[PDB]
């Protein structure tokens, strides 16, 4: 198929493996999650413009709106975590081992 689809899929896998490998922060995890959303947006848009399927032109906007509301919800969870522990470090979220 098209060559750009390989690159957008590989960008999704890069932000996947970044989201699937935490370093220290939770904000870096949310940035990798929204990079995954960005690659979904681009790849869906290239398919829909590529096929001239008219009605699905409203699909990437709905993807954007729902996952940005999801991003706001995750930022609110991050705010509550950082207010509890002082930092957004994921190693402070460890009380559920016992």
């Amino acid at each position: 198929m098209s060559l750009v689809y390989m690159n957008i899929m590989m960008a999704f896998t890069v932000s996947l493996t970044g989201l699937l490998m935490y370093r220290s922060h939770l904000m870096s995890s949310l940035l990798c999650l929204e990079g995954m959303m960005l690659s979904l947006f681009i790849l869906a848009t290239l398919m829909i413009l590529n096929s001239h399927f008219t009605l699905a032109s409203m699909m990437p906007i709905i993807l954007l709106v729902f996952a940005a509301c999801e991003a706001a919800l995750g930022l609110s969870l991050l705010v509550m975590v950082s207010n509890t522990y002082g930092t957004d470090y994921v190693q402070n979220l460890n009380l559920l081992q016992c």
């Binding site: 906007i61 954007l64 709106v65 940005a68 509301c69 706001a72 705010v79 950082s82 002082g86 930092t87």
Partner: protein
């Protein structure tokens, strides 16, 4: 193409003026001046998230000048007034539960 040339020209002029503003006052070798978490507000985050969600509702509202050209005007007018009504209901709920307070 002409847009990309214009963007590159604006970026180049901006970068050239930044280079002048940082390097031209480094010509006149001055004296060597040797003499010698942040507090959190919930209201800043709530005005940022209220902006974000109202901007998503704006993202729904932006194709209305194109939506007015439709043949299904009863449905289009209904859903247009319904989205602006849900933006107003979000604003009313943001009002009455003390969300718009001390940054009103």
């Amino acid at each position: 193409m002409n847009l990309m040339i214009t963007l590159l020209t604006n970026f180049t002029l901006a970068t050239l003026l930044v280079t002048i503003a940082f390097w031209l006052p480094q010509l006149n070798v001055y004296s060597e001046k040797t003499s010698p978490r942040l507090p959190f507000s919930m209201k800043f985050f709530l005005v940022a998230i209220t902006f974000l969600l109202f901007d998503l509702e704006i993202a729904l509202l932006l194709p209305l000048p194109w939506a007015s050209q439709t043949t299904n005007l009863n449905t289009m007018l209904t859903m247009a007034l319904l989205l602006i009504f849900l933006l107003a209901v979000s604003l009313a709920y943001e009002w009455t539960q003390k969300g718009l307070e001390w940054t009103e």
